[PDB]
């Protein structure tokens, strides 16, 4: 029953990574895997984001 008024504790550095890679990637879309913590239920936290390999994906 995760039905709540939930939250995400982002990390601005990961925001920087996202803008860095999508800003000047291929004209297509990019996708990767998070690195944070399922800290709680009614919120969550994020800290880290790695860059992704360039394998033809979506």
């Amino acid at each position: 029953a995760v039905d709540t008024a939930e939250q995400v504790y982002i990390s601005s550095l990961a925001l920087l990574k996202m803008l860095k890679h999508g800003r000047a990637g291929v004209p297509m879309e990019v996708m990767g895997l998070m690195l944070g913590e399922f800290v709680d239920d009614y919120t969550v936290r994020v800290i880290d984001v790695f860059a992704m390999p360039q394998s033809g994906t979506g």
Binding site: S12, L15, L16, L19, K20, R23, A24
Partner: peptide, 8 residues
């Protein structure tokens, strides 16, 4: 180098 201030 670039703006990227969409968040900054």
């Amino acid at each position: 180098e670039e703006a990227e201030e969409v968040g900054v």
